Write a protein that binds this DNA or RNA. Structure first.
Ligand SMILES: [Cl-]
Ligand SMILES: [Cl-]
Lengths: 289, 289
DNA sequence: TTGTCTCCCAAAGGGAGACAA
DNA sequence: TTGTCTCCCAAAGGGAGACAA
């Protein structure tokens, strides 16, 4: 069940492609992630790759999640999320659990008692256990978390604006995680050169290479199912078409995102204007007509 | 004076070479730092480089120090350090200042008063100010730090085994720093490939490239003055010679550290046995006969 | 010399409804 | 519905010598 926790801490719509399936590796997207004179490398804009391995992991102190993926080029369970408020982080009080959250995720309280209460034990990404006291009190009544909250906010160093996740599997085990609100080993040019050179060798030799996916630090996925890439490139978009991605927008143009470095590429090849003002260049597979 | 603080947080004997001087870039050492199938790159084992720029910096949250250096290949003020003990970090009590520390570093207390005391204001690497109360009390008497200590240990998240630094310049300004007791963006092969490829292009084209120095994460310096490299290579070592580095040892052999990848290199080319048991391969410039 | 303990008084917070958004 | 406030009783800690390493 921890694997389902990892995707929760990552994001609701991450959906990593399944190991052993063909995927489209898009180097320009890999470059955008590790960006959150130089040797130029002649390299294809999409590299169809076999997904050889996925390793999910998390940094214990930072609690951030990342995955190691191994590529070789070729020839639903109940949960809830809440963004933390001031009273949740502040020393006084506890944690206000949303009403919909307690009925669908947390185990159902025995309302015969007064106040209804249970000792909740939850596991985080690294196997630790956290004992929260889940109570039903106040006027008007509300679901709170008291005993373990003060300890939990202090060791995981949460502040307001972050968010906590709770995830119950069909198993008895309850799982908890946190998602924090949004250059120390190599310089940017060296990181740049590294990505493209590993990819260039891997593409020419048809040999294994590896990369790290940071779903939180990733503006858009750069390892997507190869069939999803092919369907969007086959489908013809035209200016003025109506698409969704739920936000709605209109396609204002279709050209290359970078004709100098990455010519002929479908990466962010669509120019769109957003209907509601609340990035104007997106890729074909992200939008749906 | 903050530049002298950076070298304190780095280490006592770091002594970065001065900008504008010729240096010897040793790729194998750069590789050892970022290590704390693959394309092989034909590259020299020492690259004489002009040191174009040094940028000293520090991560605010982690408090770790690193420097960005720009290379182009070609054709004392009073301070004290104390490792933190349990009573220094524990909630009760304060901070015990060593006796030698208060007389040579901290401003001299006015012992006419009772208890002698002063409000100390210190700056860390990032311009912040910390107010400590420096008192002389106890029986037998001792120099302590009280008021600001509890706050300082909690925000900088110090534990036992770390160390605090205090540094007074000739200016009135007092400076404080901490040194903490001893793969999230790129995989190791990609980092490897990046270092060597940036160096290979920079060496062939005689163009600028950059690197990051992590003095705490660095087992031995890999950017050294070019004259220091040349003197040690000119000097002939022989087996059984007596050297110092203060520890004392004997030279047991002289061969290549890696004949396959880095042949003919002077990097860690000396085999030594240590006189006191309390790495047995070192480079010529680190040892002194 | 200095780390660690004990213990005292004040502070800081765990947890409880009271109130509007 | 739920964030925030107030305020009460217990806890946790700031700071002070007392003692050996
Ligand atoms: Cl895992
Ligand atoms: Cl600086």
């Amino acid at each position: 069940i921890d694997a389902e926790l990892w995707y929760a801490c990552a994001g609701p719509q991450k959906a990593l492609p399944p190991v052993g399936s063909v995927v489209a590796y898009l180097p320009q997207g890999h470059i955008e992630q590790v960006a959150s004179q130089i040797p130029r490398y002649n390299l294809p804009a999409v590299i169809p790759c076999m997904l050889n391995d996925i390793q999910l992991s998390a940094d214990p102190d930072s609690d951030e999640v990342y995955a190691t993926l191994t590529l070789c080029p070729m020839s639903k369970s109940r949960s809830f999320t809440k963004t933390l408020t001031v009273s949740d982080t502040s020393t006084h009080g506890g944690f206000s659990v949303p009403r919909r959250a307690a009925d669908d995720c947390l185990p159902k309280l025995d309302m015969s008692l007064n106040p209804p209460n249970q000792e909740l034990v939850a596991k985080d990404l690294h196997g630790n256990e956290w004992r929260f006291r889940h109570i039903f009190r106040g006027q008007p009544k509300r679901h709170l978390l008291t005993t373990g909250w003060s300890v939990f906010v202090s060791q995981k160093r949460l502040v307001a604006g972050d968010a906590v996740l709770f995830l119950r599997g069909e198993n008895g085990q309850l799982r908890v995680g946190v998602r924090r609100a949004p250059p120390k080993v190599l310089t940017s040019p060296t990181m740049h050169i590294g990505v493209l050179a590993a990819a260039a060798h891997a593409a020419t030799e048809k040999s294994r290479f590896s990369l790290i996916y940071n779903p939180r630090s990733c503006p858009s996925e750069f390892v997507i199912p190869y069939s999803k890439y092919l369907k969007a490139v086959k489908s013809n978009f035209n200016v003025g078409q109506r698409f969704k991605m739920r936000h709605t927008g209109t396609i204002t143009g279709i050209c290359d995102f970078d004709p100098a470095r990455w010519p002929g590429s479908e990466w962010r090849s669509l120019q769109v204007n957003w209907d509601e003002s609340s990035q104007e260049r997106v890729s074909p597979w992200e939008v749906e007509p």
